[PDB]
Symmetry: C3
Subunit: 76 residues, 3 copies
C-alpha cells in the first residue's frame, strides 16, 4: 500500500542520510590533513574521498526522487 511504501522509502532515506554524515565527517578530516600536509598523494586521496561523498549524495537524491513519485501517486 501507499503508506507502507512511503514509510519504507523514508526509512531508506534515513539510512542514506546516515552514510552521508559518516562520509561528510570522513571527508572533513582528510581535508584537514590535506591542508596540514599537502602532497600529490594527499590530493589524490582527498579527491577519492570527495567522489565517494558525491556518489552518496547521488543515492540520497535518488531516494528523494522515489519518495516524490510515491507522494504524487498518493495524492491523486
Amino acid at each position: 500500500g501507499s503508506e507502507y511504501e512511503i514509510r519504507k522509502a523514508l526509512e531508506e532515506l534515513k539510512a542514506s542520510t546516515a552514510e552521508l554524515k559518516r562520509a561528510t565527517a570522513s571527508l572533513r578530516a582528510s581535508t584537514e590533513e590535506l591542508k596540514k600536509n599537502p602532497s600529490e598523494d594527499a590530493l589524490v586521496e582527498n579527491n577519492r574521498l570527495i567522489v565517494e561523498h558525491n556518489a552518496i549524495i547521488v543515492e540520497n537524491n535518488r531516494i528523494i526522487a522515489a519518495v516524490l513519485e510515491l507522494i504524487v501517486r498518493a495524492i491523486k
Copy 2:
C-alpha cells in the same frame, strides 16, 4: 498544484537524474585514471569533472525543490 505541472516537473527531474548518472560514471572513470597516473594536470582535470558533477546535483536539487512547492500547493 496541477497534475500537469507536477507531471512535467517530475519528467524534468528524470532528465536531470539522467545527466547525473552519465556524470557520476564519467567522474569515476577519470578518478580511476587519476589514481593510476597521478599528476598535476590529472588532478586539475579531475577537479573540473567533480565541479561539473556537483553542478548537476545542484540542478537536480533545484528541480526537487520545485516539485516540493508544487506538491505543497496541490494538497492545500
Copy 3:
C-alpha cells in the same frame, strides 16, 4: 500546525538554495583560477571550496528530507 511548519521548512530550503548558489559561483571561479595557474596550493584551495560546497548540498538535502516528512504527515 502542518501548514505553518511546511511553510517554515520551505523558507529554510530557499535560504539554503541561496547559499548553494553563492557557493557554486565562488567554486566555479576558483576552478577558473585553478586551470589558469595550477599549483599544489591552488589544488588544495580548490578542494577546500569543493568540500564547503558539498557540505551545503548536504544541508539542502537535509531540509528536503524534513519537508518530505512533513508532507507525508500532512496527507495522512
